[PDB]
Ligand SMILES: *Cc1cc2c(cc1C)nc1c(=O)[nH]c(=O)nc-1n2C[C@H](O)[C@H](O)[C@H](O)COP(=O)(O)OP(=O)(O)OC[C@H]1O[C@@H](n2cnc3c(N)ncnc32)[C@H](O)[C@@H]1O
């Protein structure tokens with residue numbers, strides 16, 4: 001049912017990503033119509049003498065060529081007929097079956113227009129594929145409570161490295177199910193994902209509050225994630241005090257970002273619920289900024305920033321992004337060590353998560369502590385300036401050197417490792433053994449997601 005394409009435009013797109021650095025070209029781009037087509041192509045690669053590389057591409061949001069298939073075939077998973085959301089009395093809630101290449105923004109519009117339902121756990125940006133985020137974790141402000149997107153999926157259909165289609169879940173082929181989740185595309189291509197859904201709120205009360213003290217900012221973020229009244233989203237950002245009294249206390253400001261979701265039924269209590277939660281906090285008085293907007297508009301906020309950047313030609317620039325999971329016991333050292341020390345290129349995100357919401361059976365790698373932070377350096381290099389990218393890449397290495405030199409047991413999220421001993425150290429002995437065993441079972445020829453640079457033929 002599917003077709004091989006050698007169109008130079010398809011080739012060029014399959015040879016690039018959001019990172020803007022890695023440029024490994026495939027021989028062809030495959031456009032499947034169904035799971036059977038993906039299975040046929042992977043089947044061909046597995047049975048070939050050479051054993052060519054096959055990689056699924058979602059929306060091409062990788063930073064270092066993770067979706068690239070050097071001299072092989074890139075499967076363009078992007079998209080008729082869609083499954084409707086379903087209620088189950090056994091699970092006590094709703095779900096929806098989606099194609100692995102579906103963008104979260106399309107999943108959202110679909111579930112909202114069919115029963116006013118929506119996923120519970122997000123990414124900050126919705127123009128990402130389901131297969132792509134489920135191969136990593138999928139994190140945003142809801143993860144502290146609902147867990148990442150890999151903790152909100154009931155079932156998958158996976159095309160293995162042997163071209164076999166397998167239905168898997170916690171009760172059916174669990175080794176494959178848990179291996180694939182956070183598995184970096186190593187054990188198969190997700191063709192179907194059964195996403196957990198909740199009744200969607202209609203509106204969002206979006207709040208931002210400032211702090212000049214890192215100890216007070218982290219203590220409040222940690223208290224908020226332990227919360228029965230609670231915010232529905234908890235994030236934060238590090239900002240230079242200059243780019244805005246508060247300056248006399250600190251040269252670095254920390255912005256706390258929270259939301260309170262509501263609908264027709266809770267609209268009467270939202271204002272007081274917010275006031276009660278805010279009163280318990282230690283943010284700077286008079287620094288509260290509030291916005292009231294529809295749920296879709298809040299979830300799509302990064303796409304709005306994207307459209308503005310595209311107009312100025314500031315979107316298709318190199319993005320040397322660095323994402324770290326930092327144990328909460330070592331977060332204080334980041335303030336003078338990195339935020340005031342090493343530091344750039346754009347926003348610096350920071351927020352804690354609860355490890356108990358992450359299933360330890362998955363392939364995802366988190367620090368060995370109950371509370372850990374995402375610390376994301378979301379830099380953009382200057383357009384057409386290779387030296388700007390080089391200076392930012394040196395800044396990222398200095399951050400990694402700092403973690404190593406002070407014994408911070410940080411773990412990279414969307415890991416950019418390429419050497420065997422780096423991957424061994426990332427996973428650790430027990431997780432590395434489990435990962436290698438899963439590779440021998442599901443992708444012995446190392447056909448899939450070779451751009452990750454973990455295994456070789
Ligand atoms: C660009 C970007 C990324 C991003 C983000 C905002 C922007 C502007 N915000 C994020 C956030 O808030 N939370 C989060 O967890 N991640 C965030 N990201 C990063 C993003 O999740 C990743 O880039 C991820 O890779 C998803 O992006 P995409 O869907 O574009 O996928 P890819 O980059 O093409 O491929 C990633 C890897 O997975 C393999 N792959 C792709 N599709 C599949 C399927 N269906 N099955 C199995 N493996 C698959 C690729 O081969 C590659 O190895």
Ligand SMILES: Cc1ccn(-c2ncnc3[nH]cnc23)c1
Pocket residue numbers: 124125302305306347349378
């Ligand atoms: C290139 C760009 C512009 C805004 N962002 C983001 N802003 C806030 N949170 C984000 N999360 C992921 N990308 C984000 C990324």
